[PDB]
Amino acid sequence: AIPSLSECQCGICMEILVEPVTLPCNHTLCKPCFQSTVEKASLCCPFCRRRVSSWTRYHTRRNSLVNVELWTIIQKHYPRECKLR
Amino acid sequence: HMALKRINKELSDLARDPPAQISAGPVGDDMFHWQATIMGPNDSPYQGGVFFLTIHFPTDYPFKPPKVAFTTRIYHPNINSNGSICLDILRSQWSPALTISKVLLSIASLLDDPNPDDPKVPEIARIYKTDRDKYNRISREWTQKYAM
Amino acid sequence: KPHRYRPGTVALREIRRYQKSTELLIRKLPFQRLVREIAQDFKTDLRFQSSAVMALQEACEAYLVGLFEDTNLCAIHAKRVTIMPKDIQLARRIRGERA
Amino acid sequence: KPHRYRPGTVALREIRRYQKSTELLIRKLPFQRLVREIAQDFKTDLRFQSSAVMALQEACEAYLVGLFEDTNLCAIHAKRVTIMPKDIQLARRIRGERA
Amino acid sequence: MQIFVKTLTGKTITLEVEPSDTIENVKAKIQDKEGIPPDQQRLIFAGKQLEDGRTLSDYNIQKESTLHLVLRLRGG
Amino acid sequence: SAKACTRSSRAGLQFPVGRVHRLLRKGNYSERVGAGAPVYLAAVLEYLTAEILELAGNAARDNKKTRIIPRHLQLAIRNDEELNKLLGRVTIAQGGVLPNIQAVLLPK
Amino acid sequence: SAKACTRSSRAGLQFPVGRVHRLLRKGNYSERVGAGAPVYLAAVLEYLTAEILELAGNAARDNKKTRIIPRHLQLAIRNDEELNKLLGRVTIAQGGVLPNIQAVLLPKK
Amino acid sequence: VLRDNIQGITKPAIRRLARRGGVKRISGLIYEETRGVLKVFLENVIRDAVTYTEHAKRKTVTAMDVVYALKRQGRTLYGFGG
Amino acid sequence: KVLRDNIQGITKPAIRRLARRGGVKRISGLIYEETRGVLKVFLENVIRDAVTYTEHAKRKTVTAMDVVYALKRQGRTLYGFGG
Amino acid sequence: KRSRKESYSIYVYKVLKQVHPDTGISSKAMGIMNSFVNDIFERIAGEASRLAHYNKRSTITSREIQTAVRLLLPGELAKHAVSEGTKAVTKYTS
Amino acid sequence: RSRKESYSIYVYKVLKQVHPDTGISSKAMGIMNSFVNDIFERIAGEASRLAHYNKRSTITSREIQTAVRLLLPGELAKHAVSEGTKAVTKYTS
DNA sequence: ATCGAGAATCCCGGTGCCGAGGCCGCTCAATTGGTCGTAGACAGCTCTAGCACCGCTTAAACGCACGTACGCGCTGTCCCCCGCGTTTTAACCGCCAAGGGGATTACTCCCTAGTCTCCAGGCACGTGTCAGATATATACATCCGAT
DNA sequence: ATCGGATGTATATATCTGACACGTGCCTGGAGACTAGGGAGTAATCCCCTTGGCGGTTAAAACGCGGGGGACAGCGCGTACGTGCGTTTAAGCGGTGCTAGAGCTGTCTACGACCAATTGAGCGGCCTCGGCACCGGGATTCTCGAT
Ligand SMILES: [Zn+2]
Ligand SMILES: [Zn+2]
Known part of the structure; x- marks a missing residue:
């Protein structure tokens, strides 16, 4: 099955996901929101409140924050929504 | 930008889904500054208690916590x-x-039953923790003399 | 007829067992007696708190384990399996403890 | 008819010679250019005092000399007279620079 | 005998008291007229705070005298 | 931050701020100590301790235990490259060593 | 002592007592500095400097030179034993290295 | 008085330490060299420990002295204070 | 004004002379690449601290003193250049 | 009686509870964490003091601590530590 | 310009006292200055740490003596402590 | 390529213990307020040398050819740790008992930071001169092919 | 076992030059006198814990024997590296031009040191209950001699 556009939008800024980060707590949100949170927020996942600092370091070293499957699926389904930015 | 659209969506959501015992709105043309009123819960010494409060919104939200203040003493x-x-x-x-x-309902709940684990004013904290009756009717006398 | 293990197949078992647990390996009283001997060689009429003796034992075990690790690595480098005193001397000289 | 030394004597002569000399064995300009390249990789638009470049070169030469000394000693330990890369990383591992 | 009280909130109030009246009585009357708690007031006259135990006559406060009130918050 | 509140919770920390300020002032490090230095140092200490404790707790939960022992701390410290490099010359008491056997020594 | 001459000359030293005292006081080492510590430290520093200078001068004389060059200092430091242990991590500019070759390298008779 | 106590560190103890280290086959002359190097290491640490415990005009060598000596030597130890 | 493949400036005879000073008779054919890698790593390690030191002081020219103290911090103290 | 001793026990326990709400910690682990915290504090403070003494200053501001953190810690740890310090200082200011 | 303190003349005097004829070059001057600074810094830091460990607040002569005994190897330490004791004894009277 | 007997290791269930976590009382240091001497941030000026360019030598790097010597694989020998069984020894636990020194408290006393004043020791600058690097030409130690 | 080339290394002598040792102005830092008071030396007391000893039991250490796998020595090879020579490349040195930036100086304003009062965060001591240590039984899995 395919999730709808209403569900896939970022849970923080109500926007379409922008190369999101897949957290170990199985939470997905757009990369600008994640960078803002790690830069100046509590450095914890907003939903279930579990810090991801070590995993963040491990994936930042390898540049694996982006989840390319979500990018490909969202751009093949909805080019216009991504292109309007 | 993102903050303005977020505040607009929050306003739309609270308008289409009004909360309980409270109300809120933009005090002026600026979307950042906000005003609200709350009513004293019935299961409390806050009978006949209407309270006006103001909310100041930073340049980003919900990225940063907004400021809340009680205009009514x-x-x-x-x-x-x-x-x-x-x-x-x-x-x-x-x-x-x-x-x-969420924050308005949480503060309403806190007014419903305050938490004395981390008191703000220790003297009235110990007044409350000493016995219920004097705290209850003294809170009642303010909530009648001030709110009404 | 009696079951005898091949030479070298139980040393691996000992390696696996000792690399998993973290107890002390040197008997406490002989080490304490040796430490007291060295101390009275340095200064006479000394008394040792048990915590100090335990700390010394911990440090000695750590140092010896590291030295044997380096010695094993050198012996493997030498296309051998046995560790010999020349390996220990080489490891100590490279680490700068003897120069 | 032409006279040529046996393979090995010239190397020993160079070892006996260079161990007395004290100047820099690396050409100044290539080392300066490499240092500037690394610096501009780290941060842009810096200028280097000549004394800083000289100190960097001296430190690098001393470090490389020590590394080659240890590598050759390991080669002699391994029943050989030729240093190979495996000797280099064995020396680095023992010295603890990479663990 | 009347005094001027100015607080940090910009509200000016008037109080009817006497020099023989204690500072505690002054604060009680302030609470009666405005609801300001007597135990959380810092009133300053001539650059010095007025202690609750003694009276106004000890501080030599006459007509038209102005008292500077600084609201005191406890805890945080 | 709002005035008139405890320094530790002003910036959302859990490590003490007054104690760190006193330690910097009385520790013979410098004649004068700035206002933001204790906050910065307390934040760094809290972050490092939180990382170490998170890794140790994860290892302990992996090891079917609900309490952290020095072995879990040793595993957490020596398993991550950055932490191992930072704590390179430090020996943890009763921590053991990481299990490894050289490939040549394995039987054929 | 009679307490008549300068502090350095009073103790019979050449290294400064006042400069060492100022460095100790202004160096952010401790709140208070004793009145005997600078003298003792100056004595230790002077003795170490005298030893190294004597060794370097002897090495230079054995090399038929009247001046101490960094090579002489490196020879003096490396050749001795206690100084080599003390300065086993330092690097001397223009120092070279002690000349030696492993016995295996030398050609067979 | 104690003498010839270096034999307290017996052959099985050295074998167990080597097995923990990760070695499979042990020669016959390792034990003497290991005893010598261990004696050297103990002498070096105990010298600084005794200096520390003597500078304070005390007479009992406590764990703080040992950890301070280890930290000075470059072998910082965790578990006994500091 | 970027620079490319400048690590080749450490030519083969230079490494050979360094080895001869170190006391090595016979040299293999693959030592040179490992030597270049080691030199690059050491330069990065020292230069990082040197640049940080010269950047904290709001300066633009790294001085020899910064290099000296970076080396001292790394444990390889240097004499004869100040400090 | 016995003199009062001050340590980093309760703060470490609070941090652990904030990280893992269902994990206890033994006494030896508490001692190890206390020693680690003290050692890291000493390292950072000493490096910052030396660096402040370099530029002929007498104040240890946030800049010296930031630079000392950048120097002592490895790459990723230093980056996240400097981010955390900047965040904490910014939140303390306002 | 600005003054820059150094131990140049003092080490030169010591050299003249030891060797009446030998000279010393500028590079050797810098090397000796760096060595003196390093040794002084090491001893001062160790003395400060010793003072702080024993809940003290002053750096007396005995703490410097203990630092010297800790730092230098055996024979050098004995010679240095003897020389310093002689110096302080001569100075105090 | 495999089957099976004997041995080592992991799971599971039950039982018992001691130390980790929460609570209570309390003493002391962190907080708040206010004051005051000064650290360095900033704007301004000077002037050093780091950068860039040009041209002329010639020393070092390079590619190629040749030869040889040693790194490596193979084979054989022997001998010495290893695994196991039996016997001797002291490690570890528990128990008791004394007293020596670490730790605390109170008292006193003198060492030193601070202030001011005064003056001379070493530093920046300049100059004369000879120690050693350089060039040139002899004397000898050592290596290599071959009897 | 050397003998004669032949190479490189070692040794004696002029020379000249630039870096080292010394003279000098001076000024900023070092030396001298007086006070206060807090840090440190010293006497007295308490009780923690450290040394010392006796008995048990038993896990660990010591000793001996068969043997099989690994350390070590010898041989052969061919390929990679030492050595020499002609050639192309850029390091090294001199000379000059320029300005970005290092370094020194004057203002003063705001960040930070010091002292009292005070009270709540944090520490010493107690108590308990559950997570962990331990034992017994059974299921699971490497291992090796024999096919
Ligand atoms: Zn978003
Ligand atoms: Zn989450």
């Missing part, structure tokens, strides 16, 4: 005279997932 075991509010949601457990409806 109302007695409370964990609230100062000038309106200073000691809420662990406000400055410690604040998260971007939290919305304005």
Whole structure:
């Protein structure tokens, strides 16, 4: 099955996901929101409140924050929504 | 930008889903500054208590916690005279997932039953913890003399 | 007829067992007696708190384990399996403890 | 008819010679250019005092000399007279620079 | 005998008291007229705070005298 | 931050701020100590301790235990490259060593 | 002592007592500095400097030179034993290295 | 008085330490060299420990002295204070 | 004004002379690449601290003193250049 | 009686509870964490003091601590530590 | 310009006292200055740490003596402590 | 390529213990307020040398050819740790008992930081001169092919 | 076992030059006198814990024997590296031009040191209950001699 556009939008800024980060707590949100949170927020996942600092370091070293499957699926389904930015 | 659209969506959500015992709105043309009113819960010594409060919104939300203040000088075991509010949601457990409806309902719940584990004003905290009756009817006398 | 293990197949078992647990390996009283001997060689009429003796034993075990690790690595480098005193001397000289 | 030394004597002569000399064995300009390249990789638009470049070169030469000394000693330990890369990383591992 | 009280909130109030009246009585009357708690007031006259135990006559406060009130918040 | 509140919770920390300020002032490090230095140092200490404790707790939960022992701390410290490099010359008491056997030594 | 001459000359030293005292006081080492510590430290520093200078001068004389060059200092430091242990991590500019070759390298008779 | 106590560190103890280290086959002359190097290491640490415990005009060598000596030597130890 | 493949400036005879000073008779054919890698790593390690030191002081020219103290911090103290 | 001793026990326990709400910690682990915290504090403070003494200053501001953190810690740890310090200082200011 | 303190003349005097004829070059001057600074810094830091460990607040002569005994190897330490004791004894009277 | 007997290791269930976590009382240091001497941030000026360019030598790097010597694989020998069984020894636990020194408290006393004043020791600058690097030409130690 | 080339290394002598040792102005830092008071030396007391000893039991250490796998020595090879020579490349040195930036100086304003009062965060002591240590039984899995 395919999730709808209403569900896939970022849970923080109500926007379409922008190369999101897949957290170990199985939470997905757009990369600008994640960078803002790690830069100046509590450095914890907003939903279930579990810090991801070590995993963040491990994936930042390898540049694996982006989840390319979500990018490909969202751009093949909805080019216009991504292109309007 | 993102903040303005977020505030607009929050306003639309609270309008289409009004909360309980409270109401809120934009005081002026500027979307950042906000006003609200709350009614004293019936299962409390706050009978006949209407309270006006103001909300100041920073340049980003819900990225940063908004500022809350009580325009009406109302007695409370964990609230100062000038309106200073000691809420662990406000400055410690604040998260971007939290919305304005969530924080208003949380503060309403705190007014329903205050938490004395981390008192703001120790003297009235120990007044409350000593016995119920004097605290109850003294809170009643302020909430009648001030709110009404 | 009696079951005898091949030479070298139980040393691996000992390696696996000792690399998993973290107890002390040198008997406490002989080490304490040796430490007291060295101390009275340095200064006479000394008394040792048990915590100091335990700390010294911990440090000695750590140092010896590291030295044997380096010695094993050198012996493997030498296309051998046995560790010999020349390996220990080489490891100590490279680490700068003897120069 | 032409006279040529046996393979090995010239190397020993160079070892006996260079161990007395004290100047820099690396050409100044290539080292300066490499240092500037690394610096501009780290941060842009810096200028280097000549004394800083000289100190960097001296430190690098001393470090490389020590590394080659240890590598050759390991080669002699391994029943050989030729240093190979495996000797280099064995020396680095023992010295603890990479663990 | 009347005094001027100015607080940090910009509200000016008037109180009817006497020099023989204690500072505690002054604060009680302030609470009666405005609801300001007697135990959380810092009133300053001539650059010095007025202690609750003694009276106004000890501080030599006459007509038209102005008292500077600084609201005191406890805890945080 | 709002005035008139405890320094530790002003910036959302859990490590003490007054104690760190006193330690910097009385520790013979410098004649004068700035206002933001204790906050910065306390934040750094809290972050490092939180990381170490998170890794140790994860290892302990992996090891079917609900309490952290020095072995879990040793595993957490020596398993991550950055932490191992930072704590390179430090020996943890009763921590053991990481299990490894050289490939040549394995039987054929 | 009679307490008549300068502090350095009073103790019979050449290294400064006042400069060492100022460095100790202004160096942010401790709140208070004793009145005997600078003298003792100056004595230790002077003795170490004298030893190294004597060794370097002897090495230079054995090399038929009247001046101490960094090579002489490196020879003096490396050749001795206690100084080599003390300065086993330092690097001397223009120092070279002690000349030696492993016995295996030398050609067979 | 104690003498010839270096034999307290017996052959099985050295074998167990080597097995923990990760070695499979042990020669016959390792034990003497190991005893010598261990004696050297103990002498070096105990010298600084005794200096520390003597500078304070005390007479009992406590764990703080040992950890301070280890930290000075470059072998910082965790578990006994500091 | 970027620079490319400048690590080749450490030519083969230079490494050979360094080895001869170190006391090595016979040299293999693959030592040179490992030597270049080691030199690059050491330069990065020292230069990082040197640049940080010269950047904290709001300066633009790294001085020899910064290099000296970076080396001292790394444990390889240097004499004869100040400090 | 016995003199009062001050340590980093309760703060470490609070941090652990904030990280893992269902994990206890033994006494030896508490001692190890206390020693680690003290050692890291000493390292950072000493490096910052030396660096402040370099530029002929007498104040240890946030800049010296930031630079000392950048120097002592490895790459990723230093980056996240400097981010955390900047965040904490910014939140303390306002 | 600005003054820059150094131990140049003092080490030169010591050299003249030891060797009446030998000279010393500028590079050797810098090397000796760096060595003196390093040794002084090491001893001062160790003395400060010793003073702080024993809940003290002053750096007396005995703490410097203990630092010297800790730092230098055996024979050098004995010679240095003897020389310093002689110096302080001569100075105090 | 495999089957099976004997041995080592992991799971599971039950029982018992001691130390980790929470609570209570309390003493002391962190907080708040106010004051005051000064650290360095900033704007301004000077002037050093780091950068860039040009041209002329010639020393070092390079590619190629040749030869040889040693790194490596193979084979054989022997001998010495290893695994196991039996016997001797002291490690570890528990128990008791004394007293020596670490730790605390109170008292006193003198060492030193601070202030001011005064003056001379070493530093920046300049100059004369000879120690050693350089060039040139002899004397000898050593290596290599071959009897 | 050397003998004669032949190479490189070692040794004696002029020379000249630039870096080292010394003279000098001076000024900023070092030396001398007086006070206060807090840090440190010293006497007295308490009780923690450290040394010392006796008995048990038993896990660990010591000793001996068969043997099989690994350390070590010898041989052969061919390929990679030492050595020499002609050639192309850029390091090294001199000379000059320029300005970005290092370094020194004057203002003063705001960040930070010091002292009292005070009270709540944090520490010493107690108590308990559950997570962990331990034992017994059974299921699971490497291992090796024999096919
Ligand atoms: Zn978003
Ligand atoms: Zn989550």
